[PDB]
Design an enzyme around this catalytic site. Structure first.
Site, PDB file in Angstrom:
ATOM      1  N   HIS A  61       0.797  -1.229   0.000  1.00 43.42           N
ATOM      2  CA  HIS A  61       0.000   0.000   0.000  1.00 43.42           C
ATOM      3  C   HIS A  61       0.836   1.288   0.000  1.00 43.42           C
ATOM      4  CE1 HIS A  61      -3.207  -2.791   0.784  1.00 43.42           C
ATOM      5  NE2 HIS A  61      -2.584  -3.224   1.867  1.00 43.42           N
ATOM      6  N   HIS A  91       5.772   6.764   6.535  1.00 46.26           N
ATOM      7  CA  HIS A  91       5.453   6.320   5.190  1.00 46.26           C
ATOM      8  C   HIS A  91       4.914   7.511   4.420  1.00 46.26           C
ATOM      9  CE1 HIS A  91       1.689   6.156   7.372  1.00 46.26           C
ATOM     10  NE2 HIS A  91       1.144   6.523   6.222  1.00 46.26           N
ATOM     11  N   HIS A  93       2.192   8.936   1.018  1.00 46.69           N
ATOM     12  CA  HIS A  93       1.136   8.787   0.015  1.00 46.69           C
ATOM     13  C   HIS A  93       1.497   9.704  -1.141  1.00 46.69           C
ATOM     14  CE1 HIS A  93      -1.417   6.822   3.102  1.00 46.69           C
ATOM     15  NE2 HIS A  93      -0.765   7.627   3.899  1.00 46.69           N
ATOM     16  N   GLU A 103      -3.244  13.396   1.034  1.00 44.23           N
ATOM     17  CA  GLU A 103      -4.496  12.962   1.647  1.00 44.23           C
ATOM     18  C   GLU A 103      -5.241  14.176   2.184  1.00 44.23           C
ATOM     19  OE1 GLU A 103      -3.526   9.388   4.049  1.00 44.23           O
ATOM     20  OE2 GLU A 103      -4.362   8.429   2.250  1.00 44.23           O
ATOM     21  N   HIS A 116       3.675  10.802   6.510  1.00 37.02           N
ATOM     22  CA  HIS A 116       3.039  10.530   7.799  1.00 37.02           C
ATOM     23  C   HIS A 116       4.042   9.880   8.738  1.00 37.02           C
ATOM     24  CE1 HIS A 116      -1.174  10.422   5.832  1.00 37.02           C
ATOM     25  NE2 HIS A 116      -0.748  11.647   6.098  1.00 37.02           N
ATOM     26  N   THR A 195      -5.997   6.625   7.921  1.00 39.12           N
ATOM     27  CA  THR A 195      -6.492   6.819   6.568  1.00 39.12           C
ATOM     28  C   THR A 195      -6.451   5.538   5.725  1.00 39.12           C
ATOM     29  OG1 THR A 195      -4.435   7.427   5.528  1.00 39.12           O
ATOM     30  CG2 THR A 195      -5.712   9.219   6.569  1.00 39.12           C
TER      31      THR A 195
END
Ligand code: Q3N
Ligand code: ZN
EC number: 4.2.1.1
Length: 257
Positions: A61, A91, A93, A103, A116, A195
């Site tokens: 992910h 990590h 996104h 996000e 994050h 999230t």
């Protein structure tokens, strides 16, 4: 089973995780004019000098850098928080192109990526217990825009070829997460959720106002990662972000005027 695709992405998650339609879901749009300056909010205390990074991992992910959280070595305190929160992992996104990937959004603006740093409240003893509590986790969110390179990110970038596909990990010792932080610790804060599944409503979000800049070459390396496992049909790990969720009965507070 869950992911970011048409048949398993964010619009599907509520079937396995009904809290996806809850009262304190994340991320949200931060409407800067509606956020309330709160002079009672304390400066954020980020104490990362004794951080011990362990591994870097493609979890299917995102990719994450994991830390030793068996002692108070890399901790977040102050700000909106009561007590001490240990750093577990960080990590990112990110998007397929630079106009999406974050996000959280700021007045509907999407950044190219979002970092994050995930911390848990030591009063609950372990992260699995902490996610069951409304004040169990604190996630520090930092926006990425594309321009100049972030030198402190390069060590991360350079090992991503070794964790291309889901399930792969590598040693990642002596990484200093202080090299990922912007100058200012001015922030917005609100009560929210993870999230990703399980979407637990356990997070105090702390979103920094100041983005970091990364280079196009750095973010392009993120986009070479794969969602798939080795040998499976290749599906670039891109657009691994959940869209903004309804604010419902929440107030976003600003640490700054
Ligand atoms: N994008 S986000 O930071 O809100 C979600 C990151 C996952 C936080 C860490 C967890 B590990 B263990 B369980 B697995 B699932 B539950 B427990 B620890 B927390 C989350 B994953
Ligand atoms: Zn995240």
């Amino acid at each position: 089973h869950w992911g970011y695709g048409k048949h398993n992405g964010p619009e599907h998650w509520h079937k396995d995780f009904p809290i996806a339609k809850g009262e304190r879901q994340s991320p949200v749009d931060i409407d800067t004019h509606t956020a309330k300056y709160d002079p009672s909010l304390k400066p954020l205390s980020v104490s990362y000098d004794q951080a011990t990074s362990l591994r870097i991992l493609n979890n299917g992910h995102s990719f994450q850098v994991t830390f030793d959280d068996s002692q108070d070595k890399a901790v977040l305190k102050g700000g909106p928080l009561d007590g001490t929160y240990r750093l577990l992992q960080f990590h990112f996104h990110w998007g397929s192109l630079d106009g999406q990937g974050s996000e959280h959004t700021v007045d509907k603006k999407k950044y190219a990526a979002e970092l994050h740093l995930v911390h848990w409240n030591t009063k609950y003893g372990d992260v699995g217990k902490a996610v069951q509590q409304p004040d169990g986790l604190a996630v520090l969110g930092i926006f990425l825009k594309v321009g100049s390179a972030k030198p402190g990110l390069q060590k991360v970038v350079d090992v991503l070829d070794s964790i291309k596909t889901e399930g792969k990990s590598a040693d990642f010792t002596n990484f200093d997460p202080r090299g990922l932080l912007p100058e200012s610790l001015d922030y917005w804060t609100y009560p929210g959720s993870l999230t990703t599944p399980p979407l637990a409503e356990c997070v105090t979000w702390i979103v920094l106002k100041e983005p970091i800049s990364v280079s196009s070459e750095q973010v392009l390396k993120f986009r070479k990662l794969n969602f798939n496992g080795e040998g499976e049909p290749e599906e670039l790990m891109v657009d691994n972000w959940r869209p903004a969720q309804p604010l419902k009965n929440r107030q976003i507070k600003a640490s700054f005027k």
